[PDB]
Design a protein around this nucleic acid. Structure first.
Ligand SMILES: *[C@@H]1O[C@H](CO)[C@@H](O[C@@H]2O[C@H](CO)[C@@H](O)[C@H](O)[C@H]2NC(C)=O)[C@H](O)[C@H]1NC(C)=O
Ligand SMILES: *[C@@H]1O[C@H](CO)[C@@H](O[C@@H]2O[C@H](CO)[C@@H](O)[C@H](O)[C@H]2NC(C)=O)[C@H](O)[C@H]1NC(C)=O
Ligand SMILES: *[C@@H]1O[C@H](CO)[C@@H](O[C@@H]2O[C@H](CO)[C@@H](O)[C@H](O)[C@@H]2O)[C@H](O)[C@H]1NC(C)=O
Ligand code: ACK
Ligand code: ACK
Ligand code: NAG
Ligand code: NAG
Ligand code: NAG
Ligand code: NAG
Ligand code: NAG
Ligand code: NAG
Ligand code: NAG
Ligand code: NAG
Ligand code: NAG
Lengths: 772, 772
RNA sequence: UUA
RNA sequence: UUA
């Protein structure tokens, strides 16, 4: 169909709307800019390659470029690969960019540059030089950037990329940049706010530096500033997972009371990890628009009990006061000031790491009439006691987070403790009201524990110690609960009445409850599903289930069952017929995951035993060594079959003769060495075929008829063992001239032989010598 | 060194003392008996091959054979591989064995034989025919076995290898076998004890059959019997993990009261899973020598409270009454009869699965004066309450087992519930008194819990719910404890005083206590080791440790640290020097396991950071992509280095220049494609080198000097990519003629090329054309 | 590949 | 391979 094969090792996209020709060569092991890049190219990405230099030749023809992304072709030693250390810094020749009249964005982050590159065109709006070795900014080097709006200069001097001196910025270096909106100088070992800065700034990032003092006029002319981040100047260093040097005598960052007086437009103020002991009300006198305030990782425990400054923040949406506890103190109570009640617009309040023994209803009374409050995060507080009934006065909330506490009768895993959570690289909430009790010490539960919480839509009990024989009495008040996460407990399914009181339960997660399934002679009633009349989804992954008192699971409602990481190999021991119908009476089941069940083979009766509307079956990662393909005829509604990461060596003689319904066949990471002669013949239903990471040498036309290939949304063939002899003439031609989407066609569809052509892409292969 | 290359694909051993020539061809993918088996061969093993027949040709020359092991060359469909099903049963021609005048043992198990093979020589003492299809035994077929002493006929008719009829044994079929000592007819669907049996029997195995009734004279003449097993006739089938058919009418196996009167010599009586409700004293009237009695999986709950039969068993060493509970009953107490106190010789008492709520001191009073009691096993009883101080009256015991209970304030994983625990295939006790509390519901511990248990040498708390901040007050009474297993709990290392009260602790296991290490901003005091002055071995595997409040671990005593499955990659993040000395002050440390820590590289300073006496270092399974071999020079006492399952592509230019001490280098499962020119030159200290499962093409003599190779105890080279051209002449010759042990030389040391020689063993490779 |  |  295609007249000219695409040989270029980069993804090319067209967006004729926004008038872009997008060439993405991210991570293609390039040592040169590839030849033959389209002349109409507008966005060119060469991130993560080993191109040692740029010159006038680099972009000679590419005069329509609006964006070059040339990040991480020489990333600093400590940040980059140790197995492929860049030997010498990126070399930028004179006149390399001055021809690109239309260039609006240039990313040269992570190239070990020593200086701000010169001869940039006046069209440039965005320049990024993060993770280089530029630690002295001179006015003279910045004249070329007259029209610049966004300037990223961070991560040029810090523990992962040191310069061993203080950062230098000439007086007024940036003042003549009259269009500058965003300046980032984070993670740079800066000692003072550089002045004077242009009044056109909207965003100023000065975090993770060595600034001990703010002068009262440092921010004087910045009447357009919207975002200010001064975090990590005078850090709180307790349990820091990076090298952390506080200011002497554990002094706070010193901020005059009138330092923010000009910032009428400020929306975000971040003062994380500044060792603050006091938040003076006077700070917020002329900021009436402040929406987000981060005061996490300070020493504001006392202040939280007083907090007069809150009276000046009626427009605040987000407040973060996490990790303000006094070292070596375990308070009895949380003392929230009445001033919290003036936070009229507050949607989100986080106070992790206050560290207190007992949470009581009254302590939260300042929050009672906050009409817009949506999230209350009291995680990581080592709370031992809480009457959960107190949250009956918080029905309007979307999330109550008591995660990581010590109670007994979505932010990243590292968040409050990472160095730079905004650093650039080279869930049941949607069901309604959520009470997150994950990672507590709840060993026993009873109905009264949930009195007055009938409004709850999701309860998270993951990672507790719950070991009891649930009999259906434990959750009686939770009449509206749609989602229970009971993973990482110690469920004992002695009673088939477990969970039946949750009459509106749609999703049950009982994954990683393997404990009692690990000892012989214990009763397990897997038939507990019968009572849950609206259950849609059941997850029982990683339970190590190798035995069951009940022979069948039953549901009229269940659509999805995850049964990964169990021992169906033992339940279906060849010769034992008793569990061959375990899932058959799940009448509405469409999706079954029985990956990771050590099924090295499937006994006969398994497919017959499957429920009638099964659509999506995974048998991945089972060490399957054999498969009777014909048995797929019992799965009359099968559409998706995942057999990835097994040991299959052969495909069926005629797939169409095995299933009338099959659309998506995943066979990646198997041991397949050849395709059968008529493999895909008349498989009119097929739409997706993954044959990647096998050991295929040859594919002949008979296997791959064009009336089937041409309905495929995608065909994966990469990481095989293709033999590029004259025998392969058809496959080589076809691959070169097909419209069919085949990912990695240029990069990992490769000849392994013979000799001459070893390591060569088949897309690039010239076989004229087969045709003389 | 060797004059004639060993080409036979079997391991050949000499024991010139016992005059044996032992040829072991186990699992060598043979379809033929190999030619050239030594003529002096005495023991020939051909287990697990696909040899389709035996004939007079098979053993023509092998006239000194005393033992043929020809098991599992055609194992029944349900028992064998589904990816390589034996197509047709093993064919044994007339006259195949009649020439083997000296043959004493013939194993033909698992070959799908239909009949007992005839023409066996009169020398035969042992014949094994398990897992065949022989389910009718006729006197006529057994005349040839005049001299036979051991006959295994089991697993010829059961659920995994069905015959679909009752087993048939002719009247008196075995009587004329006047030397028969051991008869096994287990797992055979036998319906009556065959009679009459020879009086020379010492062992009779009739378990897992369909025998409903013992006739009073079935065992009349068996005055030499030592072992009788009638288990699994009328099985107790609750929660059975195999298909289990009880006798109708809930009947027990019916044994007349005088059935054992003749068995004066009986030592072992096994009546497991016979649905017994009563144990009549009259059974044991003329058995005064009985040492082992298994009454597990019956219905003897009531009987345990009475048990008059015990008065007749003063010589009994082992009593097992496990799994006798009445279905649907949860007793308050254990009612042990006073008759237990007459068990004068008892060393081992097991009563798992009695199922009761509360254990109290008095309930065990019948055991108080059993002077030789060594093991009391009360596991899997769902006990909720036990004052552990009761065991102060059991100081003399070696093991108190309360594993798998419900307490709160070595037998195989499947044992009582497996079909045939004696079926043939094709720990802290040694420290002294052990209290095993593993797999209970203990969420909190205090010193008083251990009052009066000062004698304990090992405590097992594995798999409890212990979540507390141990401050060193919790185990105060346990002044003699040498071994604490605290794995699979939720250790919170807030206090560096944790465990310090255990002044004699030699082994601490705190593995799989990952819970609190998974959440940011939690204090962990890894320096807690300092206070344990005699600690030899610390295991803290799978703790997911990625952060630590202390920078160094300290011990004067510690020899072995297991730190597998943690996040040293995070602790040693490039640029962070703070934890590079974490193990340095473990001054006597010899063994460090830091496998599975995602160390894709080692920062410089890690080797310098190692303690000075390190002998055995594992860096396995880290995804290591690079390794500065020269830095091994800091490890002046290094003997074993395990770098298995990594991504290394190169070896050092000269290993001797890296380490003077290194004896054992494990490099298996890496990506190594060639060896350096002088790799092993002058590395005379080397004794073990595993280079298996790499991608090596060539090895030249310069890399592999013979003055080093020859003193290797072992050299592993299998599963590489060897190219068998004239360039490989040296390696091929050396491999063919070396004394040095190289495993799998016959099976997986293979040429991948070129063309001709692909898939061929290098041992078998003829390279004469390289020498014309 | 008799569990 | 800026976290
Ligand atoms: C940030 O700048 C500081 C101080 O300006 C640097 O600290 C100096 O480092 C040199 C070389 O290591 C030492 O000889 C001096 O003792 C240090 N001076 C002071 C006053 O501390 C520091 O290296 C810089 N940080 C980074 C990460 O580059
Ligand atoms: C070689 O074959 C002989 C004959 O089967 C084996 O000797 C037997 O070993 C058992 C072990 O329990 C002894 O108790 C018996 O007395 C021996 N039987 C006979 C008939 O002599 C010998 O062990 C075999 N050796 C090897 C390594 O396979
Ligand atoms: C043990 O012997 C049984 C008979 O005593 C076998 O049961 C028979 O099975 C056939 C059909 O397969 C029935 O139609 C017939 O009524 C009879 O009861 C049983 O299969 C056998 N056990 C094994 C494991 O082979
Ligand atoms: N707390 C408990 N947890 C699990 N099983 C229990 C408990 N109490 C009694 N059992 C009984 O133990 C047996 C094995 O699980 C099982 O048989 P059952 O009589 O049906 O009740 C049960
Ligand atoms: N049970 C507990 N487990 C862990 N930390 C606790 C506990 N109770 C109070 N803390 C305090 O939480 C902090 C982070 O772990 C830690 O620093 P600290 O102030 O010394 O005391 C502690
Ligand atoms: C192309 O470049 C322009 C300007 O830098 C930018 O706004 C646009 O997002 C880019 N698109 C892509 C997909 O790179
Ligand atoms: C809360 O703390 C503030 C300031 O530390 C203090 O003045 C106030 O009295 C405290 N209130 C309670 C209820 O402890
Ligand atoms: C919890 O608070 C509620 C008030 O909503 C009350 O009914 C109940 O008694 C309290 N429970 C406990 C254990 O204090
Ligand atoms: C429950 O909390 C756990 C751990 O804190 C988290 O992994 C999980 O995604 C949460 N469950 C849901 C359904 O959001
Ligand atoms: C589950 O199985 C058992 C029999 O094994 C039965 O008593 C029980 O009622 C079943 N439960 C349901 C909910 O169907
Ligand atoms: C099939 O199920 C898997 C879950 O294993 C899911 O990720 C995938 O999208 C499903 N595909 C279809 C077509 O439903
Ligand atoms: C498979 O092919 C044969 C012959 O073409 C035909 O009899 C049989 O019905 C086919 N089965 C299916 C499911 O198409
Ligand atoms: C403790 O018990 C556990 C769980 O049964 C077992 O894995 C482990 O071997 C025991 N530990 C010791 C030291 O015996
Ligand atoms: C462990 O380290 C901490 C400081 O990080 C210190 O307070 C404590 O005393 C140390 N304990 C021991 C036994 O070394």
């Amino acid at each position: 169909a295609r007249w000219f094969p695409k040989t270029l090792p980069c993804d090319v996209t067209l967006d004729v709307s926004k008038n872009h020709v997008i060439v993405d060569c991210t991570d293609k092991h390039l040592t040169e800019i590839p030849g033959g890049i389209p002349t109409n190219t507008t966005n060119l990405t060469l991130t993560i390659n080993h191109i040692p230099d740029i010159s006038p030749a680099s972009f000679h023809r590419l005069v329509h470029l609006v964006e070059i992304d040339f990040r991480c072709n020489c990333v600093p030693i400590r940040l980059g690969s140790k197995s492929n250390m860049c030997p010498r810094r990126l070399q930028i020749k004179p006149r390399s960019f001055s021809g690109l009249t239309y260039l609006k964005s240039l990313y040269l982050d992570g190239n070990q540059l020593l200086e701000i590159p010169q001869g940039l065109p006046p069209s440039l709006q965005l320049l990024s030089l993060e993770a280089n070795n530029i630690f002295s900014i001179r006015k003279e080097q910045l004249t070329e950037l007259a029209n610049i709006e966004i300037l990223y200069l961070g991560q040029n001097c810090y523990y992962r990329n040191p310069c061993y001196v203080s950062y230098s910025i000439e007086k007024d270096a940036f003042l003549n940049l009259t269009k500058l909106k965003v300046l980032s100088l984070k993670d740079n070992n800066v000692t003072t706010v550089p002045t004077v800065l242009p009044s056109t700034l909207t965003e100023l990032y000065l975090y993770n530096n060595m600034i001990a003092e703010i002068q009262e006029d440092d921010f004087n002319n910045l009447n357009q500033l919207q975002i200010l981040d001064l975090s990590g100047n005078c850090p709180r260093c307790y349990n820091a997972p990076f090298p952390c040097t506080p200011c002497k005598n554990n002094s706070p960052l010193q901020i005059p009371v009138n330092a923010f007086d000009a910032l009428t437009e400020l929306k975000v103020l971040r003062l994380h990890s500044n060792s603050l002991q006091h938040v003076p009300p006077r700070w917020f006198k002329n900021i009436n628009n402040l929406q987000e305030l981060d005061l996490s990782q300070n020493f504001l425990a006392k202040e939280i009990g007083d907090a007069k400054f809150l009276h000046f923040l009626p427009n605040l949406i987000q407040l973060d006061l996490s990790f303000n506890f006094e070292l070596q103190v375990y308070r009895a109570s949380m003392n929230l000031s009445q001033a919290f009640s003036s936070l009229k617009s507050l949607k989100i309040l986080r106070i992790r790491g206050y560290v207190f023994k007992e949470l009581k209803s009254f302590q939260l009374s300042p929050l009672h009439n906050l009409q817009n409050l949506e999230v209350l995060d009291l995680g990581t507080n080592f709370i031992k006691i809480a009457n959960l009934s107190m949250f009956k006065q918080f029905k309007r909330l979307k999330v109550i987070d008591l995660s990581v506490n010590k109670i007994s009768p979505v932010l990243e895993q590292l968040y409050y403790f990472r160095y730079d959570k905004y650093a650039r690289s080279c869930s049941c909430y949607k069901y309604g009201q959520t009470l997150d009790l994950s990672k507590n010490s709840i060993f026993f539960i009873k109905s009264s524990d949930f009195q007055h919480l009938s409004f709850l839509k999701c309860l998270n009990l993951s990672g507790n110690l719950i070991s009891q024989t649930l009999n259906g009495s434990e959750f009686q008040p939770l009449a509206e609960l749609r989602y229970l996460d009971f993973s990482n407990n110690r469920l004992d399914l002695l009673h088939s009445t477990a969970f039946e009181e949750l009459r509106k339960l749609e999703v049950l997660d009982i994954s990683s409850n393997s404990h009692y399934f690990q000892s012989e002679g214990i009763t397990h009633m897997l038939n507990f599903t019968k009572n849950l009349k609206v259950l849609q989804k059941l997850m029982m992954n990683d339970n190590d289930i190798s035995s069951s008192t009940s022979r069948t699971m039953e549901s009229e409602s269940l659509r999805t069952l995850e049964f990964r990481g169990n021992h169906l190999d033992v339940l279906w021991r060849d010769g034992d017929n008793r569990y061959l119908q375990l899932f058959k009476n799940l009448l509405k089941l469409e999706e079954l995951d029985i990956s990771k069940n050590s099924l090295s083979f499937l006994p006969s009766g398994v497919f017959d035993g499957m429920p009638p509307n099964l659509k999506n079956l995974s048998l991945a990662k089972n060490g399957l060594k054999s498969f009777i393909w014909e048995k797929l005829r019992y799965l009359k509604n099968l559409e998706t079959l995942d057999l990835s990461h097994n040991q299959l060596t052969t495909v069926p003689e005629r797939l169409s003769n095995c299933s009338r319904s099959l659309k998506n066949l995943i066979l990646k990471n198997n041991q397949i060495r050849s395709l059968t002669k008529y493999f895909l013949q008349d498989a009119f239903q097929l739409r997706y075929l993954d044959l990647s990471s096998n050991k295929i040498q040859m594919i002949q036309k008979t296997s791959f008829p064009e009336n089937v290939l041409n309905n495929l949304k995608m065909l994966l063939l990469h990481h095989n063992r293709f033999l590029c002899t004259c025998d392969a003439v058809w496959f080589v031609w076809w691959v070169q001239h097909t419209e069919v989407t085949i990912p990695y066609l240029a990069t990992d569809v490769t000849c392994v032989g013979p000799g001459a052509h070893k390591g060569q892409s088949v897309i690039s292969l010239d076989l004229y010598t087969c045709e003389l």
